[PDB]
Amino acid sequence: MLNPIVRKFQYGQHTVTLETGMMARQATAAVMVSMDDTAVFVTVVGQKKAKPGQDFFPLTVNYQERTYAAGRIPGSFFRREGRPSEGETLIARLIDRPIRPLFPEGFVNEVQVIATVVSVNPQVNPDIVAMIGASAALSLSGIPFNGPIGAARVGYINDQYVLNPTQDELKESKLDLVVAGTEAAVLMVESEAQLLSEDQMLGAVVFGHEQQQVVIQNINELVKEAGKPRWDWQPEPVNEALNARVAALAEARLSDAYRITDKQERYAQVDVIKSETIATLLAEDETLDENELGEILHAIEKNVVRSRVLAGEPRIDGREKDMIRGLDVRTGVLPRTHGSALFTRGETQALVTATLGTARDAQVLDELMGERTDTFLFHYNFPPYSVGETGMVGSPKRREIGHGRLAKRGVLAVMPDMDKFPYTVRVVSEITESNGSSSMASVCGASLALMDAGVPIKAAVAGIAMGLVKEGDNYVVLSDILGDEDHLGDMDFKVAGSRDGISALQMDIKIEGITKEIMQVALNQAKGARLHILGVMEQAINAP
Amino acid sequence: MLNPIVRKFQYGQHTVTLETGMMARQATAAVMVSMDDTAVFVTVVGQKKAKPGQDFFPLTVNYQERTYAAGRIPGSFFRREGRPSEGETLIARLIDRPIRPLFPEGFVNEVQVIATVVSVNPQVNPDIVAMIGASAALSLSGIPFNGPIGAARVGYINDQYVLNPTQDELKESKLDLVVAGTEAAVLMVESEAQLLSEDQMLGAVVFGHEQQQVVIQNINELVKEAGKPRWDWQPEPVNEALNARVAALAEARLSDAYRITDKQERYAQVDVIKSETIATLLAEDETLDENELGEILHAIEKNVVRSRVLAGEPRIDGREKDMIRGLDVRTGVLPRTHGSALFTRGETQALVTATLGTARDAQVLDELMGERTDTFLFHYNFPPYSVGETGMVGSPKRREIGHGRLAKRGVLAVMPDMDKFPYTVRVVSEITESNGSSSMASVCGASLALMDAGVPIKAAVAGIAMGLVKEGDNYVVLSDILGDEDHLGDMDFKVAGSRDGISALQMDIKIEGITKEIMQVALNQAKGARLHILGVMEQAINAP
Amino acid sequence: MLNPIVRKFQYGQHTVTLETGMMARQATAAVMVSMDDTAVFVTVVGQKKAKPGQDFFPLTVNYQERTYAAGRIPGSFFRREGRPSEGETLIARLIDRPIRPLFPEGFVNEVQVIATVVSVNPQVNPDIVAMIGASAALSLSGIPFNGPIGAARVGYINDQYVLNPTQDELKESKLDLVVAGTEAAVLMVESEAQLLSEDQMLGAVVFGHEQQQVVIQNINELVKEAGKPRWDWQPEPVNEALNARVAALAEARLSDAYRITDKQERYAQVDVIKSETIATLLAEDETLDENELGEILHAIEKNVVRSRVLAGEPRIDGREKDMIRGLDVRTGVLPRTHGSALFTRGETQALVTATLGTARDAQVLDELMGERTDTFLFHYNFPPYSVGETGMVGSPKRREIGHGRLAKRGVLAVMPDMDKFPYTVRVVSEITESNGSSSMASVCGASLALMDAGVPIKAAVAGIAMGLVKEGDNYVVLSDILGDEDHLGDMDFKVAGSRDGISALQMDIKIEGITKEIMQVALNQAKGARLHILGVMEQAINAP
């Protein structure tokens, strides 16, 4: 006989139960989460010795909702679920994003987080239930993983924050955000609100982070109770011999390379510097490990950008911190469509179109919690010609779907109700070129496309992404980040809203140690830039 | 003018016609086997040149069912037969399973045996017609094949046997099995029975094997008449200079490596030896093939386990040759689903669920013969976290479909009729951990899920797997085999049924020379092992 | 801030507008094309450096129609276009085919042509608009391209040729062809014509070629205005010391290798020479490249065949310049289906079947501009066993859909109306062996299958493909070419029709400098071979 080890704790209005060490033993980690009646079984499998020819951390999270959870036989032709829907893909991204940055730098081992829904209650979502599982299992696995993260859902009724609102409570609620992060700092946040202000939008993030602290403490006690011992992993020793040998040839040229304004001219230049430096090092001796060099050159690229921002020197394209790129607004680009828009910011632009139809063309979503019909439709396409390369095209990938739901949340608060406008609207965003924010601009393109179409929107809506360069305690907040300022930066602080308030913001932080004090600066500077986008948008069109 | 080579012979109540030499002359083999209204054109293509590193034998069988065989336009959006359905995959396995062990060891050349149905009779099933088709083609191809095999459906009407029962006669029949084997011995068997005794179930396998002998004789005469010259292929010359060089270094390590008992600790130890023995030989001589060294180590692994079980000595986990693994019967493990079950046998586990629905949720099967509705549903999911590896959560592999119907056949005889219980039942089996037989454990969890849901089944149903190790003429029968035992053994003898009779039986023999005398011993020992599972199941629940 | 470069002109009636320099700046080239209201946004991306291990030229043209162009929400389940349809792949091939031979010999850099429909007029067809867009983008990119090409649709109303007919004007027309080619010579060509004569079909190609000249002139002027400078590219230099080194060892017996008749004996002989020549050259020195030696051997294979045909020597299988291979006509090959046919030409055969149905079984094509329901279906299947190789079977390949419609082009014109025959007919072609033209042999098998089914077709239809060997100004026209005479040849000239007129005409030229006189001779010589097949076809069956 095998007996499981359990621990029960009160969380909000529901009693969350965690179980381990009875179901999957062959898997490195296995926990079964049960908020109140909704259960999600999460397993984490990680290899001890991965491949040697790996340069990227290969983490994959597969979220899947079982049909027997609600107690219904699937409506598919084969009577068996198959491909994940738009709902299941968004939750998969909601679990990956917070857990990714907690892994130590230099960890290249393949890990897979399989989260399957067991049972479901029509009141409690299982999003946040699955996020606790990936937080509990990964801490019990032994795999080097900081945290663990807490999962919290924030509501807003009567100008006051409510922890974990049900489906019936969400009908009267104004704000709907999911907050995740470690005990020390916040890590992500996915929001969907009405038109709240800047102060109350930040207060909900702090509220949820304080409430999720109960979950974090209960997992930590379970690690010392049933958790497997930590992996004996050590990062590759910092070779000071090569870090001065490569830098004496590359750091001098790469410092001058990051002053070019054009993206095409800069990326072609840094590729040449990376090519001939390795070519010379291979000509010296064939012992030097190729990849190794690729990470040293990448470390120099990170050091050149970050140090110049902290000192007070001009950015890549030679732009101050609170300064943004130039704007180009074009309404009515297509001839035989309902609505069309061409919004351009610097060197990134989105061809956004709007379509109108009857209520019969509504998307009938067969969700696990309940069957609902979606009136407003938003689609995000990211073709390879935007970044300037070749790739596969046909079916939308993870992001494509994630950024599409993001741009939907930023407009959903503005969109008129069915009582005034009873027509199904489909908005398609086509990324023509991409350098900084592609999900954001869109929201700017959607507002121009919906007016042009004839949709009576409440107020013009815009949005821009923010960044951060943090080293020690001091920090610099960036307005309208570039491609090199996001991949080498510390966070992708996306904010979208109207003239009055904020519709929806996405918080993606890569480092731990983020504070509420530096959150206010990033929130306030985004509002000043948001009004600047709208000042040019209202210059072209101001009425539907 | 083109000319065909025709052979006709009487087989039961049907006449079988074999044509070769005119259709698909470019392919190594092409045989047109069409009985009384219906046929399955089968072609074999084998590459003369083997891969560069190819180690395993790549055999791929694609069985597809054209809709114009019955004379009907397919009911789809594209109006064309696309990817194979649940049915098409099953027959493909009935073609792939008997032919695979007949290919000689050391043969790594890629071969493809595809079968396409070109016309069809509502009374004669295309499954055995395709099996004879592949048997005739592979023998006429020239590719090293130790066949040919015969195909026969046995059935059971009025305490008697009838060779290849028709679709109308199958409704009155209490048995439905397809037997495949050579002139010397049996090789496979896929069966479905309505609670039959061991003597009647064993006598059915012998009956079908004796009746299919005329098929083998008629194929052999065609090979002597219109057969392509056999391939000049010889296995790698076995040298004792390299074998004893590894055996004096690895056999001592591998002997203690199979005494570890625990799966995770055994596989970790057995991988270390493989990773070190090859590495130490490469340090001494780097001109040796790594691919050859792994095949020798696999032969040593085969010699250690088989010799220990051949003599009176406990196996890899400490069990005797009839002793079965420990049991953990659990039900009502999940809250918000109709039926819950948790079955664990030693180191294998299956989370089985039950779901109830109306006649609206019935599976509408669009088969080649005609449209029918399926009331009982069974799905088999095999995730990567079961064995402790990383894979694509995606699905569903073939083995997943083949084992899905396997467990469906074991419960179908137990399941109540439509009149007494007019509800469509959906059963989903989730493999939590895998070691030994997980398909037989799915049948044990199925009965527990149905009783928890409230489904009034006839009796309790259970299932176990049996193994064999034979060297010369003497044999040792194993009860409830482990994973490896299945790979390093000789046969996968699966038996599923109740206390009274057998509901399902699968016979997957990988070696020829199997005796009728040893089959009645393995089936009788399986009955005693099945009653042990059923006794513990009745302890937790004996009625719904 | 952002300025476009625009040039608009006239092309018969609808004014064609071309725009570049604003949309998609990151990519290599992006041109906004359109006529009246139909707009197709085409992008071309070319990679600077080639992949180390490349031997072939990777051209991947993908055409995607988006439903917001017409102003309609898609009728799909997810409400997203996604994967390319049956129609979308045909236009993708219609763009890929003419542009492929224009790339210089030796160029191996990966290029992608992404053409997407963004706006559409219900009268103007996007297919010719997308072809102009790709022609403009490839010329403005700088990537080595020997264009530009023009696109013209030719109709035939009241014995007169009409340039670019609208969808309403096509109902009166008896011809619908899409002609493509450079300023000096024609390239590809696909037609469909209710039994028209040779001079009518030939004159229509010349008509469209002369009318599309104004398009090419306006593209060339735009390149002179705002075109990115031509790529600094130079092909691999001719190795005089290596080309003679291989020839003095391989060319001697490779000349005798293309002398034997049988395909299986020839392809085994040309492979065994290559397997021995390269093995000896690698043993002599290991500094040589694997792919470089194969390119010289292929040049020998090309030179041996072409030199014999041009001089006046007998062909590979011992045929004359106008001689057609042996024919085998069989019908009623299958028992339990409506239509059955087994047509064989030389060593190529197609198992063609005809299936009868009702109006309920008709395919509803959700095309961009249109709601038409197709009553006639044609499906082409090219399995791996036809060529004697091993591959993967699943979703119909681009080559299968292209030949499927191409075989449909010849049958649709001769088929009876819905008023006299109100049954939906499905035709499925199965290629069992292939060497010459299996797509045109499917048309011959289609007429035999329909007569066996009972379809009252107006006349019998047959056809063959034509080849040409031209290196100077003198030419040799070949009737019914092989696989070796098509790859090493210069053009693929497909003709299909009845005893009175031509139903289908396809033109696939790989070389520049095609004259008017060689196009009519290849068409007139095809008529003689077409009458030969129909004469043998009438011997078996003449009336249903």
Residue numbers in the entry:
A (entry chain A), B (entry chain C), C (entry chain B): 1 to 544
What did the article's authors report about this structure?
One widely occurring ribonuclease with such multi-functional versatility is polynucleotide phosphorylase, a phosphorolytic exoribonuclease (PNPase; polyribonucleotide nucleotidyltransferase; EC 2.7.7.8).5,6 PNPase processively cleaves single-stranded RNA substrates in the 3′-to-5′ direction using inorganic phosphate to attack the phosphoester linkage at the 3′ terminus and liberate nucleoside diphosphate. E. coli PNPase core forms a homotrimer with a ring-like architecture that encloses a large central channel. The two RNase PH-like domains within each protomer are spatially related by a pseudo-dyad axis, so that the PNPase trimer has approximate dihedral symmetry D3. In the current study, we solved several crystal structures of E. coli PNPase core bound to its cognate RNase E micro-domain, including a complex with O2′-methyl-modified RNA bound and another with manganese in the active site.
PNPase core was co-crystallised with its RNase E recognition micro-domain (residues 1021–1061) under four different conditions, providing several independent views of the micro-domain–enzyme interaction. The location of the micro-domain on the surface of PNPase is corroborated by an orthorhombic crystal form that, while diffracting to only limited resolution (roughly 3.6 Å), has four independent PNPase trimers in the asymmetric unit that reveal unbiased density for 12 copies of the RNase E micro-domain (results not shown). A segment of 20 amino acids from the RNase E C-terminal domain forms hydrogen-bonding interactions with the exposed ridge of the amino-terminal RNase PH domain of PNPase in an extended β-sheet and also makes van der Waals interactions through a small helical segment. The interaction is at a distance from the active site, and it does not affect enzyme activity (S. Nurmohamed et al., unpublished results).
